[PDB]
């Protein structure tokens, strides 16, 4: 059984003009290149976004697809909490 918390958190923050953004927090920024992971997810979703301050930010609400997309990048789906 899993011996850690649901350490990759995915949640929504407000953007302007009635839009929203998806935040992915908890990917180890020391070990992995969050800029690169952001670029990959941006390309898969054709959306804007950035990596900053230890988090990835994506334009729009991508909670519907984020577990599949992070699993395409090898992340364990049990570590991912979509909030
Ligand atoms: O972020 N302004 O909704």
From Swiss-Prot:
Keywords: Protein biosynthesis, Translation regulation. The keyword Ribosomal protein does not apply. GO terms for molecular function: mRNA binding; translation initiation factor activity. Disulfide bonds: none annotated. It comes from the Archaea. The keyword ATP-binding does not apply. GO terms for biological process: formation of translation preinitiation complex; regulation of translation; translation reinitiation. Belongs to the SUI1 family. This is Protein translation factor SUI1 homolog. It comes from Pyrococcus horikoshii (strain ATCC 700860 / DSM 12428 / JCM 9974 / NBRC 100139 / OT-3). The lineage of its organism: Archaea, Methanobacteriati, Methanobacteriota, Thermococci, Thermococcales. The chain holds residues 17 to 99 of 99 of the full protein.
């Amino acid at each position: 059984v899993l011996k850690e918390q649901q350490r990759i958190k995915v949640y929504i923050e407000r953007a302007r003009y009635g839009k929203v953004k998806t935040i992915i927090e908890g990917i180890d920024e020391k070990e992995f290149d969050l800029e690169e992971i952001a670029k990959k997810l941006k390309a898969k979703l054709a959306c804007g976004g950035t990596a900053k301050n230890g988090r990835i930010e994506l334009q729009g609400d991508h909670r519907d697809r984020i577990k599949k997309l992070l699993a395409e990048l090898g992340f364990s789906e049990e570590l991912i909490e979509v909030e």
